[PDB]
Amino acid sequence: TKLFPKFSQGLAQDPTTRRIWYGLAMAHDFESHDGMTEENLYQKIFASHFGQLSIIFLWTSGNLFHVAWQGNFEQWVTDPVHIRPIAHAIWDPHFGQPAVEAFTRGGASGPVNISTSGVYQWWYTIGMRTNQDLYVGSVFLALVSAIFLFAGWLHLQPNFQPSLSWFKDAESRLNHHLSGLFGVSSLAWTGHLVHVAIPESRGQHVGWDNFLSVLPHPQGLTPFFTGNWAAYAQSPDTASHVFGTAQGSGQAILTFLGGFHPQTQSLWLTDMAHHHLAIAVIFIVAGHMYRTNFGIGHRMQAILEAHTPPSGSLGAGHKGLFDTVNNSLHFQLGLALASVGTITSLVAQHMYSLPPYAFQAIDFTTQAALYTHHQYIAGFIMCGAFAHGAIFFIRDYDPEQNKGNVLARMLDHKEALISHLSWVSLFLGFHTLGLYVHNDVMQAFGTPEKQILIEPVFAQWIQAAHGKALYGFDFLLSSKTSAAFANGQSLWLPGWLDAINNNQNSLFLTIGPGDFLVHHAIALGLHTTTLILVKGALDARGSKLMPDKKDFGYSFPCDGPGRGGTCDISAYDAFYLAVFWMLNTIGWVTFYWHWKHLTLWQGNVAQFDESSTYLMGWLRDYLWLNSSQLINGYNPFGMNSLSVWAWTFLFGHLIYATGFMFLISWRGYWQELIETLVWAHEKTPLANLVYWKDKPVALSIVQARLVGLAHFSVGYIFTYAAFLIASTSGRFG
Amino acid sequence: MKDFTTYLSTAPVIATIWFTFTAGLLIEINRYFPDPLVFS
Amino acid sequence: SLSIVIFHFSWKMQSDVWGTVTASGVSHITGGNFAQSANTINGWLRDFLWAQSSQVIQSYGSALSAYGLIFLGAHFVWAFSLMFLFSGRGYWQELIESIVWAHNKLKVAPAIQPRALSITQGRAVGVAHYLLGGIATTWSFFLARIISVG
Amino acid sequence: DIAGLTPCSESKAYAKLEKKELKTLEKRLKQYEADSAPAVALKATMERTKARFANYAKAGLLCGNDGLPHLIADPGLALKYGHAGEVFIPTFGFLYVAGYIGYVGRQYLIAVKGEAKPTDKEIIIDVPLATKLAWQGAGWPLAAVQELQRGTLLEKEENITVSPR
Amino acid sequence: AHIVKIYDTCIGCTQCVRACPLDVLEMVPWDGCKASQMASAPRTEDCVGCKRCETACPTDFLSVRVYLGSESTRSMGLSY
Amino acid sequence: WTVPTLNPDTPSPIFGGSTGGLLRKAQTEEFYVITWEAKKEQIFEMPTGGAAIMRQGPNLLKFGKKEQCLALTTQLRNKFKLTPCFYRVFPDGKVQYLHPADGVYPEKVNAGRVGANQNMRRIGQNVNPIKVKFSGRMMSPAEI
Amino acid sequence: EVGPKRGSLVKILRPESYWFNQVGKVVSVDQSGVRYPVVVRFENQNYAGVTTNNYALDEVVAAK
């Protein structure tokens, strides 16, 4: 039999091409490998994590190297407002001379790509000023990548493999990760800001060669050890400070100004220094909570066992959950993806409205790409969070050990949960779509005053509570007599209120009826996607149509045409259907973010306010209007620098449409077609001398759903990425 | 005639009459009270 | 295949045959851009679909505004059909089980047991909506265009 | 006014919008005769347009910078400033009709469950019974509440089928 | 090879055996039902996984179950 | 009843031939032979496509996979009320007999058969997947 | 003398049955000591179109 795959004898004995495809697709499902034990499972995962870490630091090293080698960082730092950053050089032998000239720009030697990832603003903010600064960082991270790779090898060796119990010491790992991984890293990052980043923003060079002889503050550590910590907040950078120079600069290293630096339109460095110092203290303290070898602290099992409501409303409460969580990796992975997935959305939300990197706001293409980038990644992570929660129920859930606790009771009323999610999705869809169609008919008939425009009073009321005085609610921070206004009036409100009432920045943009409709469409996306994913998990173990679904696994094709038909009945298929709704939801979010910002960046916000209340406005004034430059990247008269995005735009449409083939036409058609191809090859003279070793067959039922979904997603992403960058960059960049 | 009235009681026939009635009522109301947006 | 046939006819006629006769000569609706532009996929996207769809998307507020509405509605029906084509009745029968439970809880469950469509009916419902949406989209786009300029 | 809005009766953009719509209608009018069929139809449209803009201003709606009416949904703000007719009152108008339709259908469904062949009473409607239940539904909120308090609104958990768990 | 299991709810109707298009199943004597016979799966190496047997079983839930497993020339239904 | 012995010289039906017949698999892995007795010459439908005339008396056909042989067997039994039997033939010359395994068609109960893959429980009494985890391979709860 | 009376109504308790927690009419009860003697008929068919099934003595209880 064939060697590959070495981890499954069932695959290795398959004489068809399914062996190749399935061998690739089951490589990282360690639990399903032949001869796998629990202890070997954890040691492989530990080794794999070292590999991922080494790739991350190597990928970062490659970015640093190419910007220094081929970028214009040293030129960009001089005039960041009027210089486009360079990502890397182009050496494409297929280029013609017009293409070579078209992509030559920014004073570069030859063709180059413009960066959109914002690394220039990030690196410039944290104190990098020269190409040699980037070169040393690149070599340092390449070395760090090597060390992690060695550690991955080291801990696979006979005397360094941790035992199974080592991976299940929950109290000790939480203490270290909270205090050391989070707390000390944040404390160390405060050291960089106080010692390097802040001085570099004030025109003083601090490097490894002189940082031991430079005083971060004129009073060196006397305020710190004497408790007079307020001395570090005196004489902050003035409003006239020019970033990177000593004119208008101050001396404070810890402040709470609370606003935006007037020139860079980004958060103050002294606030970001005090921010990281504050959480570092909290995280170091929080890391002394759990039991270890020293006789103090909590044991997490005791905490869970205690929290049972005395009235029996939650049944057994949280009894038995410690083993349920501590023994299942899919439960832990589901909690990790759900938490990280939400934080990825939070990063996108807060970075566009509280830009932390100098000159990030004015780079419109970078801001658009960064928000879209992280929202699409958050969407994928959330779908994975529910997928592994569904896998937990099939593989790791033990009904006997979870008898009567909160987890078991979720399955008890799963129909109630699914029924109510179904109602909310239907309600939002009916009325959200209905109002849009009503407004479209009114616009078509020429009566824009007959449409249903509902003021977002609840959201506009929140903005009033934060100090936005436009709506006249005179509430909390919007009223100058409230205690909330008075108490903070000496710490951060003067800066915060100044920024929130500036209508040229993205801090709490003004909202109207156009924002009301879009937000309710977003809710429909979240609820429907949750409905599909939640049903896939709660029904994973069985249903009326298939009472014993657990016996078949997480992913199987179907149960056949009997009992009416069971296509797409597994929990794997519920995730597969939910990915479509995730893309649809994130699409609505990113269209909404992009259109509301393009109108702001052009100064004509009225277009969004007027055209966003009906769906023809989106198609006409957003998709059609902003495609004009994209599709002219190359035309019968020539081409320009946008021809790559024009080409990638159609490239996306093609991959997307190809995915329809794997989703619409199913296996039986193709297997019978391949059988005539097998006949044709064998009877053809001069070709039947050559022969195959793996019998050709059609893709499997499950494989084609993944292959179709992969093409659908890739085409989805590449089409909008090309349009997002091209429309934003051509308009302003 | 009993069978014919039974045929008129079938679901498709009832729905056609019911929605024809329901639609007619709404159309007639908007004919005499054009452009209703607020109860007032 | 027929969509390309009627796009070929529409662009070729406007570019090379249809037009207004004047003293100097014949000026065509699209000015003879078929020969140089229809040899790339980008040419069809820009010169045919994007440029000529200007009439349909600007129809609101005029007598042709109906074609604008059907242009959007056709786009909707087409995308709606992909729900039936990309899914299978196994998911939907389980979904109806939870929905039926809510009706049973309220003593309002029907006597005719709800069932998800059969496998074949899902494919038939999918293709019928796919065709109606796609064909109606071209229908609105053609008439609003040719009536406006032709 | 509320949320920075202003009454449509006092809105400059709102007034300008009416002129634009009337101007469009007038432009088409002057290509016909005085009392021809097309001219009469256009004049009728202009009368409805003028009436519509007077009614919305008279109703005391709020117009934004766009000069289009906006609706107030918070019950407190609506009753505070006399906007109850936009969303608040129509909210309880719809629920009465929606509960009427749902309650009537539920009564009919229970009625035929006692018959020998309930399925044949669903494809072939029992019109005499349906009309009887249609009229009695006007008091559904009273009947609906009394069922809830007597405990006959919901089925018992033990009489409802559920999947293995 | 797929896995085919017969459970003790079989009533010996023989419909699964008739339905099978590869002669995988057969009936054997039994004392656990009125028919005094039970379905058997002695030749699962020829099973292709069509699940025609499950379509034909009257009992609820099924008394014959097919669990698709390792693929081969016979189970993949290849003539080449 | 005793296991029949295949006769390779048995005459075959009158068939022109088609492109739906045996492939290179028959020469390297295995093929299947079905034989039966015909009361009179008659036209039947080949599972590979087309129509063939069965000679009166013994007939023999060769097919590429087992399902094709048992598809023809169903046609012969249901319509023509015949009693065909087919074998598995290997390239080395070995011949394996099957269907009927014991001479009686499986639909009819016969003494001497031993139950196989019979679980003396219901589907609802299987253990949970967690209890058959790390058993060396992917194992369903039904297997144990 | 074993099982419920013919024609009486019973409630099904087999969790894997389509008619779990539902009422059906007893058609006959086998007295030969078979595994599942009780035969029950239902007015609503299951997903396969069947309306009858066999149950053990302890899987069925009298209506209420």
Ligand code: CLA
């Ligand atoms: C102080 C001791 C210490 C430290 C520093 C670490 C560190 C680490 N451990 Mg842990 N570990 C410890 C003790 C420690 N461990 C002990 C005592 C045990 C035994 C009980 C373990 C057992 C253990 C296991 C079993 C595993 C780890 C793993 C890891 C790694 C997790 C992945 C990672 O890099 O996350 C980095 C995370 C952060 C820096 C924080 C992320 C969250 C913040 C809030 C995100 C946002 C921050 C900021 C805004 C981002 C800026 C971005 C920039 C672009 C601007 C990490 C290197 C895993 C690994 O990968 O091993 C190779 C792993 O599998 N550890």
Ligand code: CLA
């Ligand atoms: C981890 C980050 C870090 C590190 C490594 C340093 C390192 C240094 N700082 Mg800086 N500093 C930091 C954070 C850091 N700082 C922060 C967050 C602030 C803002 C409050 C400052 C503000 C600051 C000022 C104002 C000054 C320094 C100075 C110095 C230098 C002399 C320190 C000395 O002799 O202390 C001697 C101190 C001791 C012997 C006792 C230290 C006891 C404390 C509580 C530390 C306990 C251990 C700690 C928990 C370990 C953390 C992890 C570890 C790996 C670092 C030295 C290069 C001085 C200098 O001259 O710089 C050139 C100076 O004037 N720092």
Ligand code: CLA
């Ligand atoms: C850190 C998070 C994490 C980790 C450790 C895992 C780990 C695992 N997952 Mg999970 N998963 C994650 C995130 C994670 N997942 C996310 C984010 C999602 C949502 C998308 C999922 C959704 C998911 C599903 C639905 C399933 C798993 C499964 C698995 C297991 C097998 C994986 C395998 O064999 O892949 C093999 C890898 C492949 C076949 C290829 C992966 C790449 C895909 C197809 C995209 C490729 C795009 C391509 C590069 C684009 C080219 C563009 C072109 C222009 C060049 C394994 C335990 C499977 C399992 O067995 O669970 C029990 C399973 O069914 N995961």
Ligand code: CLA
């Ligand atoms: C534009 C495409 C589209 C549309 C409109 C829908 C709509 C819907 N999907 Mg679907 N879906 C789609 C694409 C779409 N999907 C795709 C591509 C996939 C991937 C396979 C899925 C996968 C999917 C899943 C897995 C699920 C849904 C669900 C839903 C429902 C969400 C709740 C809702 O909006 O209720 C409001 C209803 C609508 C907006 C539907 C349209 C209503 C129209 C406008 C009514 C018109 C009536 C009028 C009288 C005219 C009739 C004319 C006719 C008689 C000739 C809804 C029925 C969920 C569901 O069923 O929840 C209950 C669900 O579980 N969808």
Ligand code: CLA
């Ligand atoms: C859907 C949720 C929701 C939300 C976000 C709001 C939001 C608001 N409501 Mg409304 N309200 C709602 C539902 C809601 N309401 C409902 C269901 C009712 C009952 C039908 C009311 C009845 C109501 C009244 C009677 C009043 C408000 C008022 C307000 C405003 C300030 C007080 C408040 O409610 O704070 C946040 C909201 C909540 C925490 C939810 C419960 C709110 C209760 C029901 C009302 C609280 C009134 C408050 C004590 C008034 C004090 C005086 C005020 C000037 C400070 C604010 C814009 C007040 C107003 O007009 O201010 C200008 C006011 O007088 N609401």
Ligand SMILES: CC1=C(/C=C/C(C)=C/C=C/C(C)=C/C=C/C=C(C)/C=C/C=C(C)/C=C/C2=C(C)CCCC2(C)C)C(C)(C)CCC1
């Ligand atoms: C199925 C399953 C699963 C999964 C799950 C998931 C995936 C979930 C998710 C979830 C989520 C995703 C959630 C979230 C949540 C959130 C929240 C809950 C929030 C909250 C918040 C708050 C509370 C806030 C507050 C505030 C404000 C608002 C303002 C100011 C400040 C403060 C803070 C005060 C698992 C794994 C378990 C397993 C089993 C099964």
Ligand SMILES: CC1=C(C/C=C(\C)CCC[C@H](C)CCC[C@H](C)CCCC(C)C)C(=O)c2ccccc2C1=O
């Ligand atoms: C087109 C199609 C086929 C036929 C397609 C086949 C046989 C695949 C042919 C692929 C060729 C060999 C090209 C592959 C090119 C890829 C880019 C290879 C990537 C390889 C990775 C390992 C990197 C199916 O078999 C099928 C099965 C079930 C549902 C839908 C379908 C379906 O849509």
Ligand SMILES: CC1=C(C/C=C(\C)CCC[C@H](C)CCC[C@H](C)CCCC(C)C)C(=O)c2ccccc2C1=O
């Ligand atoms: C959405 C969907 C369903 C669910 C759709 C269903 C059950 C059809 C719904 C039809 C109508 C809306 C329900 C019946 C309405 C009655 C006639 C009563 C109407 C009364 C008045 C309101 C007119 C499938 O069953 C299905 C099956 C196979 C592949 C894909 C799918 C699929 O995508």
Ligand code: SF4
């Ligand atoms: S498994 Fe089903 S079809 Fe086969 S004999 Fe038993 S009851 Fe009959």
Ligand code: SF4
């Ligand atoms: S799955 Fe098909 S081949 Fe296998 S036993 Fe059932 S009917 Fe026979």
